Amino acid sequence: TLVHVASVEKGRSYEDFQKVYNAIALKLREDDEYDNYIGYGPVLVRLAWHISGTWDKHDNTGGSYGGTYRFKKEFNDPSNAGLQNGFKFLEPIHKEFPWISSGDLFSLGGVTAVQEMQGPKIPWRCGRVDTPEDTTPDNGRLPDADKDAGYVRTFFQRLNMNDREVVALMGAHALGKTHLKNSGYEGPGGAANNVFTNEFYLNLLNEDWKLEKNDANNEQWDSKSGYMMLPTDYSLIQDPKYLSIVKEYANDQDKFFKDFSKAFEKLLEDGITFPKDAPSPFIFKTLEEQGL
């Protein structure tokens, strides 16, 4: 398999990355109108996941390391429709801090978004290094939404995620919304879609879901409250193993936060070899903690 060794941007340390975090966090606060006042947090979380979710454990292709989303093949992946909004948000940040690698910037955008939306602290490591256009993974490595629990389980084995990690990661679907023009699905998953909570699990268990067709002729699960779940989301309450874990997170906010933090860091670091003398993971302070 390919080896990708983390290489710290020359001379940089925690303070440098905290400044980048702060610039992203301040722009998140500033650009509040986006997507009918949802703001950019959810799309930045999705971007960090999609740049990581191309990874294949079998040969170490894809993954966040190479920053390959910047290349046309990947940014034009139909699975990535709408993420251009996140990329455009990050452009002025990259211009201000041209020394940060693209993979570091995209992954840090996700960490910053989660924390600024009052989610768990996500430790983050620097050292992703931009790789050439020919290292861009082909389209088709990101998951389909119209599938069942068996599909989800098998899909995530490629990313070395187990049942607990899958169910934890999926809690991010509390955030933002599906947009018909991007993915052929429409609607939010709950009421608090720019604040990071365990609402995804509570809504799965507590809403009265009806299997309906949307205006793109795709099936999705809809509630009277105006929420929606993808078939792959709903599969987490159809499969008995996933259901137990859904119930656990619906009943323990802290446990969900801790497990999401671990799985999300792991997702963002898949494929990267960290030297034994690499810096420890950074835990950034939020703007609120800094009084900014």
Q: Which residues bind ligand HEM (CB under 6 A)?
A: 42-43, 45-46, 49, 82, 143, 145, 152, 169-170, 172-173, 175-179, 182-183, 185, 230, 232, 264
49 interface partner picked from ligand HEM, ligand Cn1cncc1C=O, none, CB below 5 to 8 A per type: ligand HEM
- Choosing from 109, 188, 231, 271, the residue that interacts with ligand Cn1cncc1C=O (CB under 6 A) is 188
- How many residues in the shown chain lie near ligand Cn1cncc1C=O by CB under 6 A? 11
Q: At what angle do helices 102-116 and 253-269 cross, to 10 degrees?
A: 170
- Choosing from 228, 245, 263, 268, the residue that interacts with ligand Cn1cncc1C=O (CB under 6 A) is 228
> Which range binds ligand Cn1cncc1C=O by CB under 6 A, 7-15, 60-68, 150-158, 224-232?
224-232
> Which range binds ligand Cn1cncc1C=O by CB under 6 A, 6-14, 32-40, 74-82, 168-176?
168-176
Site for ligand Cn1cncc1C=O contains 230 (CB under 6 A):
yes
Q: Which two tokens stand for residue 243?
A: 């259901």
- Choosing from 161, 229, 237, 267, the residue that interacts with ligand Cn1cncc1C=O (CB under 6 A) is 229
Site for ligand Cn1cncc1C=O contains 50 (CB under 6 A):
no
Q: What is the closest distance, in whole angstroms, from the C-beta atom of residue 109 to ligand Cn1cncc1C=O in the complex? A: 17
Of the pair 59, 146, the CB lying nearest ligand Cn1cncc1C=O is at 146
228 interface partner picked from ligand HEM, ligand Cn1cncc1C=O, none, CB below 5 to 8 A per type: ligand Cn1cncc1C=O
The residues binding ligand Cn1cncc1C=O (CB under 6 A) are 173, 175-178, 188-189, 228-230, 233
